[PDB]
Amino acid sequence: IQSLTARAPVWLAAQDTLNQLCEQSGETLASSNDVTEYMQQLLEREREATVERDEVAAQKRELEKQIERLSQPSGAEDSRMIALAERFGGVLLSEIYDDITIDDAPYFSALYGPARHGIVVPDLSLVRPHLETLEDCPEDLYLIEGDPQSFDDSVFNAEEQTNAVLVKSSDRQWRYSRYPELPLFGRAARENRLEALNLERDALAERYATLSFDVQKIQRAHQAFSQFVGKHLSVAFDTDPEAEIRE
Amino acid sequence: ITIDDAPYFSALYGPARHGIVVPDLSLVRPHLETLEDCPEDLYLIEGDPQSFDDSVFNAEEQTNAVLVKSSDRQWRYSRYPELPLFGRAARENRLEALNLERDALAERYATLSFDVQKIQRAHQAFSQFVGKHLSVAFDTDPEAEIRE
Amino acid sequence: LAYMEGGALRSMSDKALGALRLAVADNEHLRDALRLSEDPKRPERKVQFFIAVYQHLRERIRQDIIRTDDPVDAIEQMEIELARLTEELTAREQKLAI
Region of C47 please: left (phi>0), alpha (psi -120 to 50) or beta.
Answer: alpha
Task: Find all residues with CB under 8 Å of A210, minimum gap 6, and list them.
Answer: none
Which 8-state DSSP code applies to residue A97?
A: T
**Exposed, middle or buried: residue A225 (CB in 10 Å: 0-12, 13-18, 19+)?**
buried
C-alpha distances out from residue A211 to A220, C77, C90, Å? 14, 14, 17
Q: Which resolution in angstroms does this entry have? A: 6.8
Separation of alpha carbons B17 and B11, rounded Å: 8
Question: Which H helix or E strand runs over A36?
Answer: helix A32-69
Tell if the CB–CB gap between C80 and A24 is shorter than 8 Å: no
φ/ψ of residue C53, rounded to 5: -50, -55
φ/ψ of residue B42, rounded to 5: -55, 135
Tell if the CB–CB gap between B74 and A115 is shorter than 8 Å: yes
Strands across the sheet with B20-22, in order?
A: A157-161, A164-170, A173-178, B41-46, B20-22
Tell if the CB–CB gap between B77 and A140 is shorter than 8 Å: yes
**Exposed, middle or buried: residue A121 (CB in 10 Å: 0-12, 13-18, 19+)?**
buried
If you measure CA to CA, which chain A residue comes closest to C91? A57
Task: Find all residues with CB under 8 Å of A96, minimum gap 6, and list them.
Answer: A120, A148, A151
**Residue B131 with chain A: CB contacts under 8 Å:** 32-33
CB B99 within 8 A of CB B91: no
**Residue B134 with chain A: CB contacts under 8 Å:** 234
Could you say which of A131, A154, A161 has the minimum Cβ distance to residue B74?
A: A154
Compute how many other C-beta atoms are within 10 angstroms of the C-beta atom of residue C98.
Answer: 5
Picking from A32, A39, A225, A231, the residue whose alpha carbon sits closest to that of residue B125 is: A32
Separation of alpha carbons B36 and B20, rounded Å: 17
Separation of alpha carbons B54 and B1, rounded Å: 13
Picking from A167, A194, A235, the residue whose alpha carbon sits closest to that of residue A68 is: A194
Picking from A158, A52, A58, the residue whose alpha carbon sits closest to that of residue A107 is: A158
Tell if the CB–CB gap between C83 and A24 is shorter than 8 Å: no
**Exposed, middle or buried: residue C1 (CB in 10 Å: 0-12, 13-18, 19+)?**
exposed
Question: Which H helix or E strand runs over A15?
Answer: helix A2-24
Q: Do chains B and C touch (3 or more CB pairs under 8 A)?
A: no
A35: closest CA of chain B, how far (Å): 10
Which 8-state DSSP code applies to residue B133?
A: I
Q: A114 CB near a chain B CB, below 8 Å?
A: yes
Q: A173 CB near a chain B CB, below 8 Å?
A: yes
Q: A110 CB near a chain B CB, below 8 Å?
A: yes
Contact partners of C by the rule of 3+ C-beta pairs under 8 A? Answer: A
A interface test, pick of B70, B112, B134 with most A CB neighbours within 10 Å: B70
Tell if the CB–CB gap between A213 and C80 is shorter than 8 Å: yes
Tell me the residue type at A29.
L
C-alpha distances out from residue A61 to A49, A53, A72, Å? 18, 12, 18
Picking from A234, A16, A23, the residue whose alpha carbon sits closest to that of residue C2 is: A16
Binding site members of A for (R)-4'-phosphopantetheine: 246
Q: C83 CB near a chain A CB, below 8 Å?
A: yes
What size, in residues, is chain C? 98
Picking from C75, C30, C80, C72, the residue whose alpha carbon sits closest to that of residue C51 is: C30
Compute how many other C-beta atoms are within 10 angstroms of the C-beta atom of residue B45.
Answer: 21
**Residue C81 with chain A: CB contacts under 8 Å:** 213
Give the technique used to solve this structure.
cryo-EM
Distance of CA A88 to the CA centre of its chain: 37
Question: Which H helix or E strand runs over A141?
Answer: strand A140-144
Which 8-state DSSP code applies to residue A225?
A: H
C interface test, pick of A60, A216, A227 with most C CB neighbours within 10 Å: A216
**Exposed, middle or buried: residue C81 (CB in 10 Å: 0-12, 13-18, 19+)?**
middle
**Residue B8 with chain A: CB contacts under 8 Å:** none
Give the angle subtended at the CA of A56 by the CAs of A55 and A60, to the nearest 5°.
Answer: 120
